[PDB]
Design a protein around this ligand. Structure first.
Ligand SMILES: *[C@H]([C@H](C[C@H]1CCCO1)NC(=O)[C@H](CC(C)C)NC(=O)[C@H](Cc1ccc(F)cc1)NC(=O)OCc1ccccc1)[C@@H]1CCOC1=O
Ligand SMILES: *[C@H]([C@H](C[C@H]1CCCO1)NC(=O)[C@H](CC(C)C)NC(=O)[C@H](Cc1ccc(F)cc1)NC(=O)OCc1ccccc1)[C@@H]1CCOC1=O
Ligand SMILES: [Cl-]
Lengths: 301, 305
């Protein structure tokens, strides 16, 4: 028993992390096979940060303008291209530590592990979720760009996030590993703001199911709700709409606990109305929304 | 910016995890140099559960009674011995992925990363604190015994915890890597309970400093307190006493934020007496106590390993 913010073991990703330098900019890259992936803004100058033309900046680079260090060894760059907002540097050595891997673009509400890195070296690992407004609430300092987010469900690393920017509210934006930003953000320092964030309702319900699996029932009640009525109430607390897809996804947890999904929805409605009245759920005094239904099954069974 | 419950990168420890089987019991072992460490109760039967005589149970075992698998490779056990509550299996091959390491016993209030493993395979990593009552609030399922906890200093892994058991409240107990239990627990299935827990005051203060560094300031006030006066409040609310050592350790954070410890203590006292009045701090509605002062410095300054 127990329930923790549990990341994937980071070793398979640690072996891929390198340092990339161009000009006076140093950040992290991801060395997979003979390709190093990193944010294209490594080629930005101090005067290129508002309206860089990355095509024009890149055509002026030679392979030797990119310094790539893997531990104490310099990797020789033998080619480069850009794919959306990511730079792909061909190197003359395939990484002998490359794990089985794929690139996946995730949807809001999905969770993943982040390996925060500086100068190509890992500093720590933590769990994150893609927020409904397409930001992530990470923990990142200067030099952390190029750090990646990933899952490792079945010995295969699924890379889903690479870190590019910090908005003034202290939250973070980045791309998938094909270089497409999550959300409407651009890799320019022009003023940008995330939409109002909302709570990931299906994840809160998954976590309430985890609480019952771990033996806690105090928040249940004798009521049910229609899906329509639940959504009318929940949206008044800035919760995301719950879809029939979400209801279907919660079927397994509902089956394991004997609590119908719409009965859990009635419990959540009352929790929003009442608060926790000095109690806690799974060690929290708030409704946690960064555990997916899949995460709960992974950790509780 | 931002602040997360952050574990150490686990790669150095993943390469040490193996599966150990004796009879019908399978659990995890830690393979370092030419020794595999695991809980001594791996030699227990379903009828040795309650009142085992480990000295007696171990004499009947031969090296081949212990099946050690590292991935798909079976390691040949060439000797065995027991140190306190841990079994040491000497194998004929040194682990080529052995990192720089040492065994360290931690103190209550100190934090560490847990690598949860099943069948010798690492499955997840998370950060824990050793509670004042010497339990840890882990997340563990069947087959997780022998999972380990660790810190990293400067490329040196400090192993501090091995998982042994789950108590009826769902919290967990284990040993250091020399087989000494943390807390008043024994490795047999007799009735046992965790004592009343308390809150790690110095860690709460560290986390309040992290909040201030991240722009959360609503709880600051003009007041200061004395160590004596605060500890009277601390005792009243089941908080651990604050010592001068704790004040000294928070010194860096006091200087960096401009809030003296006893200044922050007045903030904490008010939070205890009044609560948080509907507000949150760093995304929590509770006073968080599983970040040490060093954890806050490490995360907010970007230390790497
Ligand atoms: C990674 C770094 C992100 C790190 C820094 C702290 C945690 O994450 N990336 C950058 O700094 C980005 C570089 C550009 C893409 C060229 N820029 C940003 O993240 C900026 C930071 C910023 C914020 C506010 C400012 F007024 C000026 C700069 N974010 C940004 O521009 O948001 C848009 C915006 C909103 C509102 C007003 C103005 C702008 C790095 C970079 C180099 O090496 C690394 O590791
Ligand atoms: C590891 C496993 C611990 C795992 C199990 C879930 C998460 O952690 N270890 C064991 O099961 C221990 C084996 C003994 C040391 C011989 N036993 C316990 O942990 C017991 C389980 C238990 C819990 C609650 C109970 F009510 C009864 C039994 N804990 C315990 O003994 O608590 C004391 C007690 C209190 C009240 C009544 C009776 C006893 C393992 C085991 C084998 O392989 C693994 O991975
Ligand atoms: Cl997804």
């Amino acid at each position: 028993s127990g329930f923790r913010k549990m990341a994937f073991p980071s070793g398979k990703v640690e072996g891929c992390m390198v340092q990339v330098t161009c000009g006076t900019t140093t950040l992290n890259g991801l060395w997979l096979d003979d390709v190093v992936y990193c944010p294209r803004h490594v080629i930005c100058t101090s005067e290129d940060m508002l309206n860089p033309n990355y095509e024009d900046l890149l055509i002026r680079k030679s392979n030797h303008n990119f310094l790539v260090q893997a531990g104490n060894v310099q990797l020789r760059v033998i080619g480069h291209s850009m794919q959306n907002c990511v730079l792909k540097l061909k190197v003359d050595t395939a990484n002998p530590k490359t794990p089985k891997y794929k690139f996946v673009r995730i949807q809001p509400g999905q969770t993943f592990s982040v390996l925060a890195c500086y100068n190509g070296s890992p500093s720590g690992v933590y769990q994150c979720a893609m927020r409904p407004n397409f930001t992530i609430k990470g923990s990142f300092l200067n030099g952390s760009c190029g750090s990646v987010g990933f899952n490792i469900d079945y010995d295969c690393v699924s890379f889903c996030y690479m870190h590019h920017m910090e908005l003034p509210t202290g939250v973070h934006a980045g791309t998938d590993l094909e270089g497409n930003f999550y959300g409407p953000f651009v890799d320019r320092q022009t003023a940008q703001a995330a939409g109002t964030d909302t709570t990931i309702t299906v994840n809160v319900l998954a976590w309430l199911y985890a609480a019952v699996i771990n033996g806690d029932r105090w928040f249940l009640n004798r009521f049910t709700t229609t899906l329509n009525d639940f959504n009318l109430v929940a949206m008044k607390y800035n919760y995301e709409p719950l879809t029939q897809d979400h209801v279907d996804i919660l079927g397994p947890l509902s089956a394991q606990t004997g609590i119908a999904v719409l009965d859990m929805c009635a419990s959540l409605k009352e929790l929003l109305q009442n608060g926790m009245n000095g109690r806690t759920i799974l060690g929290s005094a708030l409704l946690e929304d960064e555990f997916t239904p899949f995460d709960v099954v992974r950790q509780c069974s």
